[PDB]
Structure 1
Amino acid sequence: YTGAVPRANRIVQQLVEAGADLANIRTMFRNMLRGEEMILSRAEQNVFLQHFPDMLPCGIDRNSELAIALREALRRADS
Protein backbone atom coordinates (compact mmCIF):
# COMPACT_ATOMS: atom_id res chain seq x y z
CA TYR A 1 0.00 0.00 0.00
CA THR A 2 1.25 3.51 -0.91
CA GLY A 3 -1.28 5.99 0.55
CA ALA A 4 -0.22 8.83 2.87
CA VAL A 5 -0.67 6.64 5.93
CA PRO A 6 1.61 3.74 4.96
CA ARG A 7 4.09 6.36 3.77
CA ALA A 8 4.00 8.20 7.10
CA ASN A 9 4.47 4.85 8.87
CA ARG A 10 7.52 4.21 6.69
CA ILE A 11 8.93 7.58 7.75
CA VAL A 12 8.47 6.67 11.40
CA GLN A 13 10.03 3.25 10.77
CA GLN A 14 13.04 4.81 9.05
CA LEU A 15 13.42 7.36 11.84
CA VAL A 16 13.58 4.63 14.48
CA GLU A 17 15.99 2.64 12.30
CA ALA A 18 18.11 5.80 12.27
CA GLY A 19 18.12 6.06 16.08
CA ALA A 20 15.75 9.02 16.27
CA ASP A 21 13.92 9.97 19.47
CA LEU A 22 10.27 10.08 18.30
CA ALA A 23 9.22 12.46 21.06
CA ASN A 24 11.87 14.91 19.84
CA ILE A 25 10.92 14.42 16.20
CA ARG A 26 7.27 15.09 17.07
CA THR A 27 8.19 18.39 18.70
CA MET A 28 10.58 19.28 15.83
CA PHE A 29 7.99 18.48 13.17
CA ARG A 30 5.25 20.47 14.92
CA ASN A 31 7.61 23.46 14.87
CA MET A 32 8.56 22.78 11.24
CA LEU A 33 4.90 23.02 10.27
CA ARG A 34 4.90 26.37 12.09
CA GLY A 35 7.84 27.36 9.89
CA GLU A 36 10.88 26.68 12.09
CA GLU A 37 13.76 24.63 10.64
CA MET A 38 14.35 21.29 12.31
CA ILE A 39 17.64 20.40 13.97
CA LEU A 40 18.28 16.94 12.54
CA SER A 41 21.12 14.46 12.46
CA ARG A 42 22.48 13.72 8.99
CA ALA A 43 20.63 10.38 9.18
CA GLU A 44 17.33 12.00 10.26
CA GLN A 45 17.66 14.68 7.58
CA ASN A 46 18.17 11.98 4.96
CA VAL A 47 14.96 10.25 6.00
CA PHE A 48 13.00 13.49 5.68
CA LEU A 49 14.55 14.29 2.27
CA GLN A 50 13.32 10.92 0.96
CA HIS A 51 9.75 12.03 1.68
CA PHE A 52 9.73 15.84 1.66
CA PRO A 53 12.18 16.59 -1.20
CA ASP A 54 11.67 20.37 -1.19
CA MET A 55 11.93 20.71 2.60
CA LEU A 56 15.19 22.65 2.73
CA PRO A 57 14.36 25.58 0.44
CA CYS A 58 10.58 25.40 0.77
CA GLY A 59 9.57 24.02 4.18
CA ILE A 60 6.69 21.56 4.63
CA ASP A 61 3.00 22.28 3.96
CA ARG A 62 0.96 21.50 7.06
CA ASN A 63 -2.07 20.86 4.81
CA SER A 64 -0.42 18.19 2.68
CA GLU A 65 -1.79 14.66 3.11
CA LEU A 66 1.66 13.34 4.04
CA ALA A 67 2.34 16.04 6.65
CA ILE A 68 -1.07 15.35 8.21
CA ALA A 69 -0.44 11.60 8.19
CA LEU A 70 3.03 12.04 9.74
CA ARG A 71 1.68 14.38 12.43
CA GLU A 72 -0.87 11.69 13.31
CA ALA A 73 1.65 8.86 13.28
CA LEU A 74 4.19 10.70 15.45
CA ARG A 75 1.45 11.55 17.96
CA ARG A 76 0.21 7.97 18.14
CA ALA A 77 3.71 6.55 18.55
CA ASP A 78 4.50 9.14 21.22
CA SER A 79 1.49 8.25 23.43
Structure 2
Amino acid sequence: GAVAHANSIVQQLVSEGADISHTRNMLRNAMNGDAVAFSRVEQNIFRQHFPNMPMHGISRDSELAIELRGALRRAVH
Protein backbone atom coordinates (compact mmCIF):
# COMPACT_ATOMS: atom_id res chain seq x y z
CA GLY A 1 0.00 0.00 0.00
CA ALA A 2 1.25 3.45 0.95
CA VAL A 3 -0.10 4.37 4.39
CA ALA A 4 1.22 1.01 5.63
CA HIS A 5 4.58 1.64 3.97
CA ALA A 6 4.85 5.30 5.11
CA ASN A 7 4.47 4.19 8.75
CA SER A 8 7.45 1.81 8.43
CA ILE A 9 9.58 4.89 7.67
CA VAL A 10 8.31 7.07 10.53
CA GLN A 11 9.07 4.03 12.72
CA GLN A 12 12.72 3.77 11.63
CA LEU A 13 13.21 7.51 12.14
CA VAL A 14 11.93 7.23 15.73
CA SER A 15 13.59 3.82 16.33
CA GLU A 16 16.82 5.31 14.95
CA GLY A 17 16.54 8.30 17.33
CA ALA A 18 15.91 10.65 14.41
CA ASP A 19 14.08 13.70 15.69
CA ILE A 20 11.03 13.28 13.44
CA SER A 21 10.06 16.95 13.78
CA HIS A 22 13.22 17.92 11.84
CA THR A 23 12.74 15.04 9.38
CA ARG A 24 9.42 16.66 8.40
CA ASN A 25 11.14 19.99 7.78
CA MET A 26 13.41 18.36 5.20
CA LEU A 27 10.56 16.44 3.50
CA ARG A 28 8.81 19.79 3.04
CA ASN A 29 12.06 21.32 1.82
CA ALA A 30 12.55 18.34 -0.51
CA MET A 31 9.13 18.38 -2.21
CA ASN A 32 8.89 22.17 -2.47
CA GLY A 33 12.27 22.00 -4.20
CA ASP A 34 14.17 23.89 -1.49
CA ALA A 35 17.74 23.41 -0.32
CA VAL A 36 17.70 20.31 1.87
CA ALA A 37 19.97 19.37 4.77
CA PHE A 38 19.27 15.80 5.90
CA SER A 39 21.09 14.24 8.81
CA ARG A 40 23.18 11.09 8.35
CA VAL A 41 20.39 9.15 10.10
CA GLU A 42 17.57 10.60 7.99
CA GLN A 43 19.34 10.64 4.61
CA ASN A 44 20.16 6.94 4.59
CA ILE A 45 16.67 5.98 5.80
CA PHE A 46 15.19 7.88 2.84
CA ARG A 47 17.44 6.49 0.08
CA GLN A 48 16.06 3.03 0.89
CA HIS A 49 12.52 4.17 0.10
CA PHE A 50 13.25 6.75 -2.58
CA PRO A 51 16.06 5.08 -4.56
CA ASN A 52 16.40 7.72 -7.22
CA MET A 53 16.47 10.40 -4.51
CA PRO A 54 19.98 11.68 -5.38
CA MET A 55 18.78 12.56 -8.89
CA HIS A 56 14.97 12.53 -9.14
CA GLY A 57 14.18 12.96 -5.44
CA ILE A 58 10.88 13.11 -3.56
CA SER A 59 8.33 14.51 -6.02
CA ARG A 60 5.11 16.31 -5.06
CA ASP A 61 2.84 13.61 -6.43
CA SER A 62 4.87 10.61 -5.27
CA GLU A 63 2.13 8.79 -3.39
CA LEU A 64 4.44 7.42 -0.65
CA ALA A 65 5.96 10.87 -0.16
CA ILE A 66 2.51 12.44 0.32
CA GLU A 67 1.60 9.70 2.79
CA LEU A 68 4.87 10.04 4.69
CA ARG A 69 4.37 13.83 5.05
CA GLY A 70 1.10 13.10 6.83
CA ALA A 71 2.31 9.92 8.60
CA LEU A 72 4.92 12.19 10.20
CA ARG A 73 2.72 15.28 10.79
CA ARG A 74 0.31 13.16 12.86
CA ALA A 75 3.08 11.42 14.86
CA VAL A 76 4.56 14.87 15.72
CA HIS A 77 1.36 15.35 17.68
C-alpha displacement of 1:6: 0.9
SS of the residue corresponding to residue 14 of structure 1 reads: helix
The 4+ residue runs of structure 1 with deviation greater than 6 A are none
Unaligned runs of 5+ in 2: none
Q: Residue 30 in 1 paired to residue 28 in 2? A: yes
TM-score if structure 1 supplies the norm length?
0.87
Q: Which residue of 1 aligns with 2:62?
A: 64
Question: For residues 23 and 43 of structure 1, what CA distance do their matches in structure 2 show?
Answer: 13
TM-score if structure 2 supplies the norm length?
0.89
Unaligned runs of 5+ in 1: none
How many residue pairs end up in the alignment? Answer: 77
Q: How large is the RMSD of aligned CA atoms in angstroms?
A: 1.2
